[PDB]
Design a protein around this ligand. Structure first.
Ligand SMILES: CC(C)CP(=O)(O)O
Ligand code: NA
Length: 387
């Protein structure tokens, strides 16, 4: 029934973060070229105006990703690419600063992914009004998704996206919405209705396509009993160690233990396939603009009055060649542990393929540096998490 057997085959993926939905920490140069107030795609496009925005963003859409990216992904042993796209690619709302033109590039991605033997997971990453208040939704600040006609507008966009892509076997799965922020104020009951509607849309166009649901930052197993359907419905949980005070304080051994505990207590408790649809090699929040442009870092005490653990100058910018052998070794230990833990359930999708230099966050960097394994058998350290 299913284009990809999420029940019985492991996902090994990367995200194309920052490509069709721009994010300051992923491409700081583009935001900094429009000044201090350009802190998300909304403000960036608004500052530039429609003509200049289309010029600068389209330059990036074209240059950031080629067919050779996808071939390198396949060479790294991957079988999936998760591709963020904003609602505005399917038509900016009246009054939106956003420009479109992204779909021509997503069309190319589907072609290139197919040629390389990869599946694509299309991810609706930003919804009208913002589902999370994060910069990566398009507009940081408030959560106004579920107000007014925002949800209907989201479904209108989703429908067009599904219609456009679900005729291709390359597109194995589609995600309802990236990181709906339940603790931030998204209503779960209404979210579940949106999920029900998304499932109907997918089944109008191709019942063979899997539907991906984010856990909304609730424990993934809490979603037991909702749309439990084998390979058809896949939960997406995002697992990071730098956005919580407990995890960020850990040493490498403790980080690794926490990954295994997460797999055993959460991934293995879900009644559905669960991809870890975002995770990374970094263990600090030092990357420039990671908490938002104009915000600092927990790690060095510059965010939320957290107490400094260490300095961020080494890990804020640049490429892992700048680090020591031991630092790369520890980073690889943490990556191997996640690969093995997350393959206990349904697999994994690394965040992200490519940056302007954010140590531990850039798979293309880590691969070339020998930090990222290229197969399940490619292990420099003992297996850290077991059945
Ligand atoms: C804090 C985290 C969960 C959200 P962002 O910093 O990635 O936007
Ligand atoms: Na790190």
């Amino acid at each position: 029934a299913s284009s990809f057997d999420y029940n019985g085959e492991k996902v090994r993926g990367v995200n194309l973060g920052g490509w069709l939905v721009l994010e300051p920490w992923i491409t700081p140069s583009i935001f900094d070229a429009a000044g201090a107030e350009a802190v998300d795609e909304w403000s960036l496009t608004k500052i530039l105006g429609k003509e200049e925005a289309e010029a600068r963003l389209s330059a990036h859409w074209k240059s950031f990703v080629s067919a050779g990216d996808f071939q390198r992904m396949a060479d790294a042993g991957l079988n999936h690419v998760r591709i963020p796209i904003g609602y505005w690619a399917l038509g900016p709302l009246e009054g939106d600063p956003y420009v479109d033109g992204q779909l021509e590039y997503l069309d190319k991605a589907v072609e290139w992914a197919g040629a390389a033997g990869l599946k694509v997971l299309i991810d609706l990453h930003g919804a009208p009004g913002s589902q999370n208040g994060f910069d990566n939704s398009g507009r940081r600040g408030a959560i106004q998704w579920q107000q007014g006609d925002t949800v209907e507008q989201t479904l209108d966009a989703f429908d067009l996206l599904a219609e456009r892509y679900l005729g291709s076997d390359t597109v194995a799965a589609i995600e309802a919405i990236n990181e709906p922020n339940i603790p931030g104020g998204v209503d779960q009951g209404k979210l579940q209705e949106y999920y029900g509607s998304v499932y109907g849309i997918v089944n109008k166009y191709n019942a063979g396509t899997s539907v991906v649901y984010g856990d909304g930052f609730l424990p993934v197993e809490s979603w037991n009993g909702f749309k439990t359907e084998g390979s058809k419905v896949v939960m997406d949980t995002h697992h990071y160690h730098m956005f919580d005070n407990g995890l960020i304080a850990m040493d490498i051994d403790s980080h690794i233990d926490a990954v295994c505990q997460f797999a055993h207590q959460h991934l293995e408790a879900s009644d559905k396939p669960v991809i870890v649809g975002e995770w990374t090699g970094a263990v600090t929040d030092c990357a420039k603009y990671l908490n938002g442009k104009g915000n600092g870092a927990r790690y060095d005490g510059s965010y939320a009055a957290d107490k400094a653990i260490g300095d961020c100058s080494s890990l804020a910018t640049g490429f892992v060649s700048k680090l020591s052998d031991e630092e790369r070794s520890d980073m690889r230990r943490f990556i191997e542990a996640q690969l093995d833990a997350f393959e206990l359930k349904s697999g994994w999708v690394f965040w992200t393929w490519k940056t302007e230099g954010a140590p531990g966050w850039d798979m293309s960097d880590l691969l070339e540096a020998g930090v990222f394994p290229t197969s399940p058998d490619d292990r420099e350290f003992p297996k850290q998490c077991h059945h």
